[PDB]
Design a protein around this ligand. Structure first.
Ligand code: ZN
Lengths: 79, 33
């Protein structure tokens, strides 16, 4: 019900601040990158410390707390 | 509107590669354990 801020930084070096819970879910987080920069969860990919972030899991699962900085892989496969 | 193949880093194995190959790299590189 609250909103915590996390820094999901693209391979283009741009930082996307989301407003979700650490105990929310990764599926939600990636939907929120789409809510910020306007790129869908298909064309972006979530990775922290070299591990891929699975949709069904949470930030807290993958050792990601609030205000953690992780990497975002742009694909732009749609064209 | 960038008519070019984008060169970007693979955040798992830390290598700079084209973006088509970055995506494919991950599918191999995230396969852990
Ligand atoms: Zn790789």
């Amino acid at each position: 019900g609250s909103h915590m801020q996390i820094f999901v930084k693209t391979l283009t070096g741009k930082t996307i601040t989301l407003e979700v819970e650490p105990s929310d879910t990764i599926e939600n987080v990636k939907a929120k990158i789409q809510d910020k920069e306007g790129i869908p969860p298909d064309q972006q990919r979530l990775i922290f410390a070299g591990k891929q972030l699975e949709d069904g899991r949470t930030l807290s699962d993958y050792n990601i707390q609030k205000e953690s900085t992780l990497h975002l892989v742009l694909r732009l496969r749609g064209g | 509107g960038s008519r070019q193949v984008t060169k970007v880093d693979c955040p798992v194995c830390g290598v700079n590669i084209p973006e088509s190959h970055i995506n494919k790299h991950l599918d191999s590189c995230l396969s852990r354990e």
